[PDB]
Amino acid sequence: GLMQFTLPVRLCKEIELFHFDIGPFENMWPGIFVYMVHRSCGTSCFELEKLCRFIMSVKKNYRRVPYHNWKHAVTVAHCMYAILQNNHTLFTDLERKGLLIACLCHDLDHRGFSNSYLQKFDHPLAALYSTSTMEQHHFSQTVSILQLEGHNIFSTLSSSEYEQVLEIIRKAIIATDLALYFGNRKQLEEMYQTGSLNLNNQSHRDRVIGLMMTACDLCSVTKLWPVTKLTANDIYAEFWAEGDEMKKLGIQPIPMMDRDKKDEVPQGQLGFYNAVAIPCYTTLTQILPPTEPLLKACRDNLSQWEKVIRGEE
Numbered sequence: 001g002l003m004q005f006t007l008p009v010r011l012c013k014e015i016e017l018f019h020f021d022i023g024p025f026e027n028m029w030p031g032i033f034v035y036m037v038h039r040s041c042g043t044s045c046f047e048l049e050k051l052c053r054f055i056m057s058v059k060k061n062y063r064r065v066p067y068h069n070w071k072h073a074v075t076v077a078h079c080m081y082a083i084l085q086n087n088h089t090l091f092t093d094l095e096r097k098g099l100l101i102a103c104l105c106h107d108l109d110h111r112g113f114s115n116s117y118l119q120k121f122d123h124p125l126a127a128l129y130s131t132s133t134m135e136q137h138h139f140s141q142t143v144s145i146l147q148l149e150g151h152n153i154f155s156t157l158s159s160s161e162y163e164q165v166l167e168i169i170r171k172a173i174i175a176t177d178l179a180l181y182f183g184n185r186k187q188l189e190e191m192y193q194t195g196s197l198n199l200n201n202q203s204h205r206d207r208v209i210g211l212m213m214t215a216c217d218l219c220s221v222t223k224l225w226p227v228t229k230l231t232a233n234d235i236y237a238e239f240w241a242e243g244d245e246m247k248k249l250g251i252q253p254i255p256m257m258d259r260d261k262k263d264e265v266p267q268g269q270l271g272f273y274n275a276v277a278i279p280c281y282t283t284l285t286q287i288l289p290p291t292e293p294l295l296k297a298c299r300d301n302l303s304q305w306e307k308v309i310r311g312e313e
Ligand SMILES: Cc1ccc(C)c(C(=O)Nc2ccc3cc(-c4ccccc4)nn3c2)n1
Pocket: 178, 217, 218, 220, 221, 232, 235, 255, 256, 257, 261, 262, 263, 264, 265, 266, 267, 268, 269, 271, 272
């Protein structure tokens, strides 16, 4: 109970910032996550022994893929920590508990393939879950790990608190299905512009937590340029492997996934910033003003991609 976690001085300072990079020392990522739970939630939210055993089983169940790996899980959880710390009073005890766990678990047992590739391959997971195929798997893996002995980090919650927190974790993980994001933002945009948005409406909170999850999941586009640029290599390594696999099935992949079309990458980033990233962080800055730095960093990176096209790098 009197045991705290402390980071070195640079991490202690930089970790509060949206654009923090968790760095290349894997063995420090668990301490970073625990430190974020303790300041975000309390030193009393979880039994330290259970939380650590939970963190290590979650790590074990992320695969060695180029992008959708353990580092992504912790990066996405750090983005949520920054949003929660900059919006202290807006969220309940349970939501802060549930969302950091949801973020750490959101891509459990990912194989580096889109829902689309699962459907065209006829993967068994696509028979079991017709929509948000991987996202229903990820939630399923989360429940499994929570049911291992010594792993119930929610043991001290009531029956109905426990069910509320698993329902928050489920909606949060489903919402990382980017196919659901477009409608979700459109509805938040309309609700905010006609002043109907109400945070005591549970169906409204759900949508807002959905957008936060999208924003944390895409937070690669909100880092400083050198981090954003190097992360894009990992993202495309998965996309091009998926493209190769599409060709193996006898299907011409979309150009995003075709390694023969590396040349067109910079223009593809423009489209994604214009269609997805900027609208995401814009709508988020409108609903949650203190998240504005994410919008600013995304715009900076769009500007860096335009410079790449213009031969200026
Ligand atoms: C989910 C997520 C999170 C972060 C990023 C950064 C991306 C991401 O990079 N998304 C996208 C979207 C569309 C798109 C088209 C292209 C293209 C490439 C080469 C030739 C032609 C077209 N790349 N590309 C990339 N996606």
